[PDB]
């Protein structure tokens, strides 16, 4: 390795196609120029578009993948014999200098392309850089975001849906054990891993995924598992007699020695402990499914409901109109930031909006647009059935500090804390909204007759990018449901 | 009752009067209502 590194860096004629300067091997330009030529079009640059699962085409981005694979495999051995004390530090310094090469994470981020090249990409980081520090793992937090999302969708015994590249994906995830050897915001990769064992497509490959879920909780905080334990307990109670024998292993690993200095609650552990007790006796005998189960205590929904024949009582007469006007005021503030002004004749070029007027004079189209989601939401939890309060002192509709007297003002209502029961109700409403989105996705998929989308997935599947929008919508729900003296609870 | 939009409620601007025998002005409201508290000159020090 030392000799080949010395000779290759003495004679770097492996030039790059786009970037200038002596040498080359600039992935940040070569990979990006090669994908636009290879993915949609054919092997040549000027060429028509054809080819599905096609694994100047397959040449350059495999030649590179081989090059960084060779560099990673010839990187000096780490943390077994040599740890910065064997004169081999100059080789690692040269490899890091070839920062530009630190952008291997950025290179792997461009997920649309053979899945096997990502194995070399992560192997380079394992060899020359290492993720032993928590900062890089906090930066990434996933082996691959879109690959993890896509492996969830590609799980079925179908011809055109899976069993085409999912095997290569499974091999790449088998390689992907970098997190092995204190979650800050929300690491939820074990929920993604839960889908893998539901239907074991690759035989014997679940052994590589067992420690990814096992050792994760040891590093993870007990409280960081919030409602994913509830979902997993639901699935475990459903499949208490199943080939998924890692459920009891996770049960033991959590319940035993999950009691830290905090000594967290066991009331939520009582809900599935009785289910496990009542489901362990009707089965007659398994040889190892009940051995370690000695101490279990310290001491997908596409259609939520149907509201075709639900009548809304007319207890909403004033606050609904007030909050519709508040939403219109927020829209007016947004269009004022855009540059729109009130006028008489609508004109897109001149940025004239004649709708800058009170809700009583507003148009029926925008009135229905503002009223339909709120009315549908109210109908939904009225259909579910919960109590409604009318507290007198909760009247915070108008308490914070142009033509027709239209003077909207910004209100900072995001500083208010809400209760856990109201949070659960808003989470149910958010699940209903996600199911509505899933319904529109199913309708458009049926209309198109073919396609796939990785957003037909539960809460924990969502990464931070979409979770930001989800939290913004949840905050809007909190703002709507925290005022007007109306309280909903069980 | 003006209810200034956003954080535009005066920000407690201070204006020392030429005489400490009568009164010193330290208000945040847009209009004066009542801050008399007639006391003899006592102290003027770091803002608290």
């Amino acid at each position: 390795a030392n000799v080949v590194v010395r000779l290759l860096i003495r004679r770097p004629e492996c030039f790059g196609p786009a970037l200038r300067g002596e040498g080359g091997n600039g992935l940040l330009a070569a990979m990006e120029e090669a994908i636009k030529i290879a993915e949609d079009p054919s092997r040549d640059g000027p060429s028509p578009t054809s080819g599905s699962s096609k694994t100047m085409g397959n040449a350059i981005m495999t030649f590179y993948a081989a090059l960084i694979d060779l560099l990673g495999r010839c990187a000096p051995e780490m943390h077994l014999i040599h740890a910065g004390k064997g004169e081999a530090i100059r080789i690692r310094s040269i490899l890091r200098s070839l920062g530009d090469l630190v952008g291997v994470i950025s290179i792997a981020f461009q997920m649309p392309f053979c899945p096997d090249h990502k194995a070399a990409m992560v192997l380079f980081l394992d060899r020359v850089y290492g993720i032993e520090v928590q900062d890089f793992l906090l930066h990434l937090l996933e082996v691959g975001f879109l690959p993890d999302l896509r492996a969830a969708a590609s799980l079925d015994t179908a011809a055109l849906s899976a069993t085409d590249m999912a095997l290569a994906l499974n091999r790449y995830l088998c390689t992907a054990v970098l997190p092995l050897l204190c979650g800050q915001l929300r690491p939820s990769m074990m929920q993604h891993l839960l889908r893998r064992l539901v239907f074991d497509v690759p035989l014997l490959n679940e052994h590589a995924k067992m420690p990814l879920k096992l050792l994760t909780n040891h590093y993870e905080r007990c409280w960081k598992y919030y409602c994913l334990p509830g979902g997993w307990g639901n699935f475990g109670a459903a499949s208490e007699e199943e080939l998924h024998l890692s459920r009891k292993l996770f049960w033991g690993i959590f319940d035993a020695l999950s009691q830290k200095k905090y000594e967290q609650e066991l009331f939520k552990l009582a809900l599935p402990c009785l289910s496990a007790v009542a489901g362990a006796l009707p089965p007659d005998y398994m040889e190892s499914n009940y051995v370690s189960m000695m101490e279990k205590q310290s001491s997908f929904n596409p259609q939520p409901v149907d509201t075709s024949n639900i009548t809304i009582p007319e207890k909403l007469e004033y606050f609904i109109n007030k909050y519709a006007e508040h939403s219109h005021d927020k829209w007016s503030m947004d269009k004022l930031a855009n540059g729109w002004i009130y006028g008489e004749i609508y004109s897109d070029s001149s940025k004239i909006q004649p709708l800058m007027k009170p809700y009583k004079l507003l148009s029926e189209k925008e009135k229905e647009i503002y009223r339909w989601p709120i009315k549908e939401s109210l109908k939904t939890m009225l259909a579910w059935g919960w109590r409604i309060e009318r507290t007198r002192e909760g009247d915070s509709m108008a308490l914070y500090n142009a033509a027709h007297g239209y003077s909207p003002r910004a209100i900072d209502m995001s500083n208010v804390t809400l209760s856990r029961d109201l949070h659960a109700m808003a989470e149910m409403m958010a699940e209903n909204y996600h199911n509505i989105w899933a319904k529109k996705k199913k309708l458009e998929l049926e209309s198109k007759g073919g396609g796939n989308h990785p957003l037909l997935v539960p809460y924990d599947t969502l990464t931070a990018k979409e979770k930001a929008k989800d939290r913004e919508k949840a905050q809007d729900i909190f703002k709507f449901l925290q005022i007007s003296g109306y309280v909903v609870s069980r | 009752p003006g209810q200034g939009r956003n954080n535009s409620n005066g920000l407690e601007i201070g204006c020392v009067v030429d005489a400490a025998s009568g009164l010193l002005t330290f208000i945040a409201n847009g209009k004066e209502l009542s801050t008399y508290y007639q006391v003899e000159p006592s102290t003027k020090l770091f803002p608290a």
Partner: peptide, 30 residues
């Protein structure tokens, strides 16, 4: 004798009062 003037030492210890968390009391102390 601040002739041709209203007051002096125009300054403020600014606290944003528009949020009104609990309708805070503001004034001098002895």
């Amino acid at each position: 004798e601040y002739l041709m003037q209203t007051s002096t030492y125009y300054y403020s210890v600014r606290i944003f009062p528009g949020q009104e968390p609990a309708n805070v009391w503001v004034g001098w102390i002895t």
